[PDB]
Amino acid sequence: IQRTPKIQVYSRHPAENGKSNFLNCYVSGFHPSDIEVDLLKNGERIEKVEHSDLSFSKDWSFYLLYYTEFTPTEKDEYACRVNHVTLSQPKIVKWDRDM
Amino acid sequence: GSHGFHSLRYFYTAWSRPGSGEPRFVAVGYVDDTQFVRFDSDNASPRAEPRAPWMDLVEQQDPQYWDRNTRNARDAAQTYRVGLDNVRGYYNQSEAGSHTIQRMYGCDVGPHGRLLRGYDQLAYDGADYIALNEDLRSWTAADLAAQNTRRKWEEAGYAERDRAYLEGECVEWLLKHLENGRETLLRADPPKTHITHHPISDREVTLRCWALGFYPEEITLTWQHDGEDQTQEMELVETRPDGNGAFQKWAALVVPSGEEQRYTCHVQHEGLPQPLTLRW
Amino acid sequence: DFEKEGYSL
Protein backbone atom coordinates (compact mmCIF):
# COMPACT_ATOMS: atom_id res chain seq x y z
CA ILE A 1 0.00 0.00 0.00
CA GLN A 2 1.71 3.15 -1.28
CA ARG A 3 0.08 6.56 -1.67
CA THR A 4 1.39 9.61 -3.50
CA PRO A 5 1.30 12.85 -1.49
CA LYS A 6 -1.07 15.74 -2.05
CA ILE A 7 0.53 19.18 -1.84
CA GLN A 8 -0.77 22.66 -1.04
CA VAL A 9 1.51 25.70 -0.79
CA TYR A 10 0.06 28.78 0.91
CA SER A 11 0.61 31.49 3.50
CA ARG A 12 -0.87 31.73 6.98
CA HIS A 13 -2.17 35.26 6.36
CA PRO A 14 -3.08 36.97 3.07
CA ALA A 15 0.13 38.09 1.40
CA GLU A 16 0.96 41.76 1.95
CA ASN A 17 4.39 42.69 0.60
CA GLY A 18 6.88 43.76 3.26
CA LYS A 19 4.93 42.25 6.17
CA SER A 20 6.27 39.18 7.94
CA ASN A 21 4.28 36.01 7.27
CA PHE A 22 4.60 32.21 7.28
CA LEU A 23 5.06 30.08 4.17
CA ASN A 24 3.25 26.73 4.47
CA CYS A 25 3.63 23.47 2.57
CA TYR A 26 0.97 20.96 3.63
CA VAL A 27 1.63 17.42 2.39
CA SER A 28 -1.08 14.84 3.02
CA GLY A 29 -2.45 11.51 1.91
CA PHE A 30 0.90 9.75 1.54
CA HIS A 31 2.25 6.36 2.69
CA PRO A 32 4.79 5.37 3.89
CA SER A 33 5.89 8.24 6.13
CA ASP A 34 9.43 8.95 4.88
CA ILE A 35 9.14 12.13 2.81
CA GLU A 36 11.42 14.97 1.68
CA VAL A 37 9.99 18.50 1.73
CA ASP A 38 12.01 21.65 1.02
CA LEU A 39 10.85 25.25 0.77
CA LEU A 40 12.48 27.17 -2.08
CA LYS A 41 13.16 30.89 -2.49
CA ASN A 42 14.00 31.63 -6.14
CA GLY A 43 15.03 27.99 -6.61
CA GLU A 44 17.31 27.80 -3.57
CA ARG A 45 16.57 25.73 -0.47
CA ILE A 46 15.58 27.66 2.66
CA GLU A 47 17.60 26.26 5.53
CA LYS A 48 15.57 26.97 8.70
CA VAL A 49 12.43 24.99 7.83
CA GLU A 50 10.36 23.42 10.60
CA HIS A 51 7.60 20.84 10.39
CA SER A 52 4.68 19.57 12.45
CA ASP A 53 4.72 16.24 14.26
CA LEU A 54 3.91 13.20 12.12
CA SER A 55 0.27 12.09 12.27
CA PHE A 56 -2.24 10.37 9.98
CA SER A 57 -5.91 10.32 8.99
CA LYS A 58 -8.64 7.71 9.42
CA ASP A 59 -7.45 5.98 6.22
CA TRP A 60 -3.92 5.64 7.75
CA SER A 61 -2.30 8.10 5.29
CA PHE A 62 0.11 10.58 6.83
CA TYR A 63 0.07 14.37 6.75
CA LEU A 64 2.67 16.99 7.60
CA LEU A 65 2.93 20.78 7.61
CA TYR A 66 6.25 22.36 6.69
CA TYR A 67 6.61 26.06 7.45
CA THR A 68 9.06 28.95 7.80
CA GLU A 69 8.82 32.66 8.50
CA PHE A 70 9.08 34.76 5.35
CA THR A 71 8.42 38.34 4.30
CA PRO A 72 6.77 38.25 0.86
CA THR A 73 7.63 40.79 -1.79
CA GLU A 74 7.15 41.23 -5.50
CA LYS A 75 9.34 39.16 -7.84
CA ASP A 76 10.37 36.89 -4.93
CA GLU A 77 9.29 33.46 -6.16
CA TYR A 78 8.55 30.86 -3.50
CA ALA A 79 7.84 27.17 -3.96
CA CYS A 80 7.63 23.81 -2.22
CA ARG A 81 9.61 20.80 -3.47
CA VAL A 82 8.43 17.32 -2.48
CA ASN A 83 9.97 13.89 -3.06
CA HIS A 84 8.63 10.51 -1.99
CA VAL A 85 9.09 6.87 -2.92
CA THR A 86 5.95 7.04 -5.08
CA LEU A 87 7.38 9.88 -7.22
CA SER A 88 9.89 9.07 -9.96
CA GLN A 89 10.94 12.74 -9.98
CA PRO A 90 10.60 15.46 -7.34
CA LYS A 91 7.39 17.47 -7.52
CA ILE A 92 7.48 21.27 -7.27
CA VAL A 93 4.43 23.42 -6.50
CA LYS A 94 4.93 27.16 -6.82
CA TRP A 95 3.36 29.54 -4.31
CA ASP A 96 0.54 31.65 -5.77
CA ARG A 97 -0.64 34.40 -3.41
CA ASP A 98 -4.14 33.77 -4.85
CA MET A 99 -4.00 29.93 -4.73
CA GLY B 1 -29.50 22.88 20.76
CA SER B 2 -26.70 20.55 19.71
CA HIS B 3 -25.09 18.59 22.53
CA GLY B 4 -21.32 18.77 22.65
CA PHE B 5 -19.05 15.80 22.19
CA HIS B 6 -15.27 15.71 22.47
CA SER B 7 -12.51 13.23 21.72
CA LEU B 8 -9.10 12.32 23.11
CA ARG B 9 -7.01 10.45 20.55
CA TYR B 10 -3.46 9.06 20.50
CA PHE B 11 -1.59 8.16 17.28
CA TYR B 12 1.38 5.75 17.19
CA THR B 13 3.68 5.36 14.19
CA ALA B 14 6.58 2.89 14.20
CA TRP B 15 8.59 1.94 11.12
CA SER B 16 11.78 -0.03 10.48
CA ARG B 17 14.77 1.52 8.70
CA PRO B 18 17.00 -1.28 7.34
CA GLY B 19 20.58 -0.08 7.04
CA SER B 20 19.88 3.18 8.91
CA GLY B 21 19.72 2.01 12.51
CA GLU B 22 16.95 0.98 14.84
CA PRO B 23 13.26 1.41 14.03
CA ARG B 24 11.76 4.80 14.81
CA PHE B 25 8.65 5.38 16.92
CA VAL B 26 6.61 8.60 16.97
CA ALA B 27 3.47 9.19 19.03
CA VAL B 28 1.12 12.18 19.24
CA GLY B 29 -2.06 13.00 21.11
CA TYR B 30 -4.98 15.10 20.15
CA VAL B 31 -7.87 16.58 21.97
CA ASP B 32 -10.47 17.14 19.24
CA ASP B 33 -8.53 18.90 16.57
CA THR B 34 -5.66 20.35 18.68
CA GLN B 35 -2.42 18.45 19.19
CA PHE B 36 -1.19 18.60 22.78
CA VAL B 37 1.63 16.05 23.23
CA ARG B 38 4.39 14.36 21.25
CA PHE B 39 7.16 11.77 21.63
CA ASP B 40 9.92 10.77 19.20
CA SER B 41 12.16 7.77 19.88
CA ASP B 42 14.96 9.18 17.69
CA ASN B 43 15.52 12.05 20.13
CA ALA B 44 18.47 11.96 22.52
CA SER B 45 17.04 10.44 25.72
CA PRO B 46 13.49 10.85 24.39
CA ARG B 47 10.85 12.43 26.63
CA ALA B 48 7.17 13.18 26.17
CA GLU B 49 6.84 16.87 25.36
CA PRO B 50 3.98 19.40 25.52
CA ARG B 51 2.71 20.84 22.26
CA ALA B 52 -0.21 23.03 23.39
CA PRO B 53 -0.38 26.09 25.66
CA TRP B 54 -2.35 24.56 28.54
CA MET B 55 0.04 21.61 28.72
CA ASP B 56 2.68 24.06 29.99
CA LEU B 57 0.53 24.32 33.16
CA VAL B 58 -0.17 20.61 33.66
CA GLU B 59 2.94 20.17 35.82
CA GLN B 60 1.46 22.11 38.75
CA GLN B 61 -1.70 19.97 38.83
CA ASP B 62 0.21 16.72 38.22
CA PRO B 63 3.98 17.05 38.72
CA GLN B 64 4.34 13.35 37.82
CA TYR B 65 2.54 13.66 34.45
CA TRP B 66 5.69 13.96 32.34
CA ASP B 67 7.63 11.20 34.13
CA ARG B 68 4.59 8.90 33.97
CA ASN B 69 4.03 9.54 30.25
CA THR B 70 7.71 9.41 29.28
CA ARG B 71 7.97 5.95 30.83
CA ASN B 72 4.86 4.72 28.99
CA ALA B 73 6.02 6.09 25.63
CA ARG B 74 9.49 4.58 26.06
CA ASP B 75 7.72 1.33 26.89
CA ALA B 76 5.45 1.64 23.85
CA ALA B 77 8.47 2.27 21.61
CA GLN B 78 10.19 -0.92 22.80
CA THR B 79 6.96 -2.87 22.32
CA TYR B 80 6.62 -1.83 18.67
CA ARG B 81 10.30 -2.16 17.77
CA VAL B 82 9.86 -5.83 18.67
CA GLY B 83 6.42 -5.99 17.06
CA LEU B 84 7.88 -4.94 13.71
CA ASP B 85 9.94 -8.13 13.48
CA ASN B 86 7.17 -10.29 14.96
CA VAL B 87 4.70 -9.22 12.27
CA ARG B 88 7.35 -9.42 9.55
CA GLY B 89 7.89 -13.00 10.68
CA TYR B 90 4.15 -13.63 10.38
CA TYR B 91 4.27 -12.63 6.70
CA ASN B 92 7.81 -13.95 6.04
CA GLN B 93 8.86 -10.63 4.57
CA SER B 94 12.52 -9.86 3.98
CA GLU B 95 14.58 -7.89 6.48
CA ALA B 96 15.76 -5.45 3.81
CA GLY B 97 12.25 -3.98 3.38
CA SER B 98 10.87 -1.14 5.45
CA HIS B 99 7.49 -1.68 7.12
CA THR B 100 5.20 0.43 9.29
CA ILE B 101 2.91 -0.25 12.24
CA GLN B 102 0.28 2.37 13.06
CA ARG B 103 -2.10 2.56 16.00
CA MET B 104 -4.97 4.90 16.78
CA TYR B 105 -6.84 4.72 20.07
CA GLY B 106 -8.93 7.01 22.22
CA CYS B 107 -12.38 7.87 23.53
CA ASP B 108 -15.38 9.97 22.55
CA VAL B 109 -17.17 11.64 25.46
CA GLY B 110 -20.70 12.98 25.55
CA PRO B 111 -21.99 16.29 26.88
CA HIS B 112 -22.68 14.64 30.25
CA GLY B 113 -19.06 13.55 30.73
CA ARG B 114 -19.60 9.82 30.14
CA LEU B 115 -18.12 7.60 27.45
CA LEU B 116 -19.83 7.25 24.06
CA ARG B 117 -17.33 5.19 22.04
CA GLY B 118 -13.96 3.64 22.79
CA TYR B 119 -11.71 2.54 19.97
CA ASP B 120 -8.34 0.95 19.27
CA GLN B 121 -7.23 0.12 15.72
CA LEU B 122 -3.92 -0.91 14.18
CA ALA B 123 -2.64 -0.90 10.63
CA TYR B 124 0.34 -2.62 9.03
CA ASP B 125 1.84 -0.99 5.94
CA GLY B 126 -1.20 1.26 5.70
CA ALA B 127 -3.87 -1.46 5.78
CA ASP B 128 -6.11 -2.65 8.61
CA TYR B 129 -4.35 -5.26 10.73
CA ILE B 130 -6.30 -5.72 13.98
CA ALA B 131 -8.96 -3.68 15.76
CA LEU B 132 -10.84 -3.75 19.04
CA ASN B 133 -14.54 -4.49 18.58
CA GLU B 134 -17.25 -2.07 19.69
CA ASP B 135 -17.96 -4.25 22.73
CA LEU B 136 -14.34 -3.63 23.85
CA ARG B 137 -14.29 -7.38 24.61
CA SER B 138 -12.79 -9.09 21.54
CA TRP B 139 -10.56 -8.34 18.54
CA THR B 140 -11.02 -8.53 14.77
CA ALA B 141 -7.94 -9.65 12.86
CA ALA B 142 -7.88 -8.51 9.24
CA ASP B 143 -5.90 -11.37 7.65
CA LEU B 144 -4.34 -14.72 8.49
CA ALA B 145 -1.08 -13.26 9.83
CA ALA B 146 -3.02 -10.92 12.12
CA GLN B 147 -4.73 -13.91 13.78
CA ASN B 148 -1.32 -14.56 15.35
CA THR B 149 -1.65 -11.26 17.20
CA ARG B 150 -5.28 -11.81 18.19
CA ARG B 151 -4.54 -15.24 19.69
CA LYS B 152 -1.64 -13.78 21.68
CA TRP B 153 -3.80 -10.84 22.77
CA GLU B 154 -6.81 -13.02 23.65
CA GLU B 155 -4.72 -15.40 25.76
CA ALA B 156 -3.13 -12.44 27.57
CA GLY B 157 -6.39 -10.70 28.55
CA TYR B 158 -5.39 -7.53 26.71
CA ALA B 159 -8.91 -6.43 25.75
CA GLU B 160 -9.94 -6.16 29.42
CA ARG B 161 -6.93 -3.93 30.08
CA ASP B 162 -7.65 -1.90 26.94
CA ARG B 163 -11.31 -1.46 27.92
CA ALA B 164 -10.25 -0.45 31.44
CA TYR B 165 -8.08 2.32 30.00
CA LEU B 166 -10.67 3.50 27.47
CA GLU B 167 -13.53 3.71 29.99
CA GLY B 168 -11.16 4.95 32.71
CA GLU B 169 -8.06 7.11 32.30
CA CYS B 170 -9.05 8.19 28.77
CA VAL B 171 -12.37 9.66 29.90
CA GLU B 172 -10.78 11.20 32.99
CA TRP B 173 -7.89 12.78 31.10
CA LEU B 174 -10.10 14.11 28.31
CA LEU B 175 -12.15 15.93 30.96
CA LYS B 176 -9.00 17.24 32.66
CA HIS B 177 -7.65 18.56 29.36
CA LEU B 178 -11.01 20.10 28.39
CA GLU B 179 -10.99 22.19 31.57
CA ASN B 180 -7.32 23.20 31.51
CA GLY B 181 -7.39 23.91 27.78
CA ARG B 182 -10.83 25.51 27.94
CA GLU B 183 -9.75 28.70 26.16
CA THR B 184 -8.25 26.68 23.29
CA LEU B 185 -10.51 23.63 23.03
CA LEU B 186 -13.94 25.10 23.82
CA ARG B 187 -13.62 28.05 21.44
CA ALA B 188 -15.61 28.30 18.22
CA ASP B 189 -13.51 30.66 16.13
CA PRO B 190 -15.55 31.80 13.11
CA PRO B 191 -13.90 32.03 9.69
CA LYS B 192 -12.57 35.34 8.42
CA THR B 193 -14.30 35.30 5.03
CA HIS B 194 -13.90 37.29 1.82
CA ILE B 195 -14.11 36.87 -1.96
CA THR B 196 -11.24 37.49 -4.35
CA HIS B 197 -11.54 38.24 -8.05
CA HIS B 198 -9.05 37.10 -10.70
CA PRO B 199 -9.62 37.91 -14.39
CA ILE B 200 -8.29 35.17 -16.64
CA SER B 201 -9.45 36.73 -19.90
CA ASP B 202 -11.67 39.49 -21.26
CA ARG B 203 -14.67 37.14 -20.99
CA GLU B 204 -13.97 34.95 -17.93
CA VAL B 205 -12.99 35.59 -14.30
CA THR B 206 -12.24 33.44 -11.28
CA LEU B 207 -14.20 34.10 -8.09
CA ARG B 208 -12.63 32.55 -4.98
CA CYS B 209 -14.39 32.37 -1.61
CA TRP B 210 -12.00 32.23 1.36
CA ALA B 211 -12.37 30.99 4.93
CA LEU B 212 -9.42 31.72 7.23
CA GLY B 213 -8.41 31.10 10.82
CA PHE B 214 -11.39 29.01 11.91
CA TYR B 215 -11.53 26.28 14.57
CA PRO B 216 -12.87 23.54 14.72
CA GLU B 217 -11.88 22.10 11.35
CA GLU B 218 -15.46 21.32 10.25
CA ILE B 219 -16.85 23.85 7.76
CA THR B 220 -18.97 24.04 4.60
CA LEU B 221 -18.32 26.32 1.61
CA THR B 222 -20.75 26.43 -1.30
CA TRP B 223 -21.18 28.65 -4.34
CA GLN B 224 -24.66 29.49 -5.60
CA HIS B 225 -25.91 30.83 -8.94
CA ASP B 226 -29.17 32.76 -8.31
CA GLY B 227 -29.89 30.18 -5.59
CA GLU B 228 -28.67 27.06 -7.42
CA ASP B 229 -25.87 24.98 -5.92
CA GLN B 230 -22.63 24.80 -7.87
CA THR B 231 -20.62 21.93 -6.39
CA GLN B 232 -19.69 20.27 -9.69
CA GLU B 233 -18.59 23.56 -11.26
CA MET B 234 -16.43 24.74 -8.33
CA GLU B 235 -12.95 23.79 -7.16
CA LEU B 236 -12.94 23.00 -3.42
CA VAL B 237 -9.54 22.50 -1.79
CA GLU B 238 -9.05 20.17 1.16
CA THR B 239 -9.17 21.93 4.53
CA ARG B 240 -5.62 22.75 5.62
CA PRO B 241 -3.91 23.93 8.82
CA ASP B 242 -2.65 27.49 8.99
CA GLY B 243 0.23 26.73 11.37
CA ASN B 244 -1.27 28.70 14.27
CA GLY B 245 -3.75 26.09 15.49
CA ALA B 246 -6.56 27.02 13.07
CA PHE B 247 -7.66 26.05 9.56
CA GLN B 248 -8.28 27.46 6.09
CA LYS B 249 -10.42 26.50 3.10
CA TRP B 250 -11.51 28.05 -0.17
CA ALA B 251 -13.86 27.30 -3.05
CA ALA B 252 -13.35 28.92 -6.45
CA LEU B 253 -15.57 29.18 -9.50
CA VAL B 254 -14.98 30.31 -13.09
CA VAL B 255 -17.62 32.85 -14.07
CA PRO B 256 -18.52 34.93 -17.16
CA SER B 257 -17.04 38.42 -17.11
CA GLY B 258 -20.38 40.20 -16.67
CA GLU B 259 -22.15 37.80 -14.29
CA GLU B 260 -20.21 38.16 -11.03
CA GLN B 261 -23.16 39.90 -9.34
CA ARG B 262 -25.30 36.78 -9.82
CA TYR B 263 -23.18 34.43 -7.67
CA THR B 264 -23.10 34.17 -3.87
CA CYS B 265 -20.81 32.30 -1.49
CA HIS B 266 -22.25 30.60 1.60
CA VAL B 267 -20.26 29.74 4.73
CA GLN B 268 -21.57 27.71 7.66
CA HIS B 269 -19.38 27.08 10.70
CA GLU B 270 -20.03 26.49 14.38
CA GLY B 271 -18.56 29.87 15.32
CA LEU B 272 -20.99 31.78 13.11
CA PRO B 273 -24.20 33.12 14.67
CA GLN B 274 -25.83 32.92 11.24
CA PRO B 275 -24.61 31.34 8.00
CA LEU B 276 -22.74 33.92 5.95
CA THR B 277 -23.76 34.97 2.44
CA LEU B 278 -21.13 36.91 0.50
CA ARG B 279 -21.29 38.53 -2.93
CA TRP B 280 -18.75 40.27 -5.15
CA ASP C 1 -1.90 9.73 29.91
CA PHE C 2 -0.66 7.44 27.20
CA GLU C 3 -1.77 3.85 27.62
CA LYS C 4 0.50 2.44 30.32
CA GLU C 5 -0.37 -1.03 28.95
CA GLY C 6 0.98 -2.78 25.89
CA TYR C 7 1.66 -6.12 24.25
CA SER C 8 3.78 -6.83 21.20
CA LEU C 9 1.94 -8.03 18.11
Numbering used by the authors:
A (entry chain B): 1 to 99
B (entry chain A): -2 to 277
C (entry chain C): 1 to 9
What does the paper say about this structure?
To verify the uncommon peptide presentation features of bat MHC I, we determined the crystal structures of Ptal-N*01:01 in complex with the two HeV-derived peptides, HeV1 (DFANTFLP) and HeV2 (DYINTNVLP), two EBOV-derived peptides, EBOV-NP1 (DFQESADSFL) and EBOV-NP2 (DFQESADSFLL), one H17N10-derived peptide, H17N10-NP (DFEKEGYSL), and one MERS-CoV-derived peptide, MERS-CoV-S3 (DFTCSQISP). Although having different lengths, the 8-mer peptide HeV1, 9-mers HeV2 and H17N10-NP, 10-mer EBOV-NP1, and 11-mer EBOV-NP2 in the PBG of Ptal-N*01:01 all display an M-shaped conformation, with P2 and PΩ residues as the primary anchors and the P5 or P6 residue as the secondary middle anchors. The structures of Ptal-N*01:01 with the 9-mer peptides HeV2 (DYINTNVLP) and H17N10-NP (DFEKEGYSL) showed that both of the peptides adopt similar overall conformations as the HLA-A*0201–presented 9-mer peptide GL9 (GILGFVFTL) with a Leu at the PΩ site. The P1 Asp of all of the peptides adopts a rigid conformation upward to the α1-helix of the heavy chain. Detailed analysis indicated that Asp59, Arg65, and the P1-Asp of the peptides in all six structures of Ptal-N*01:01 form a triangular network of hydrogen bonds. Although Ptal-N*01:01 can bind peptides with Leu as the PΩ anchor, the binding peptides can also possess Pro at this position.
Major histocompatibility complex (MHC) class I molecules (MHC I) present antigen peptides to the surface of antigen presenting cells (APCs) to active T cells through interaction with T-cell receptors (TCRs), which play pivotal roles in antiviral defense. In this study, we screened bat MHC I Ptal-N*01:01–binding peptides from different bat-borne viruses (HeV, EBOV, MERS-CoV, and H17N10) and determined the structures of bat MHC class I complexed with these viral peptides. The overall structures of Ptal-N*01:01 display the common characteristics of classical MHC I molecules in other mammals, with the extracellular region of the heavy chain folding into three different domains. The α1 and α2 domains construct a typical PBG that contains two α1-helices and eight β-sheets, and the α3 domain and β2m display typical immunoglobulin (Ig) domains and underpin the peptide binding domain.
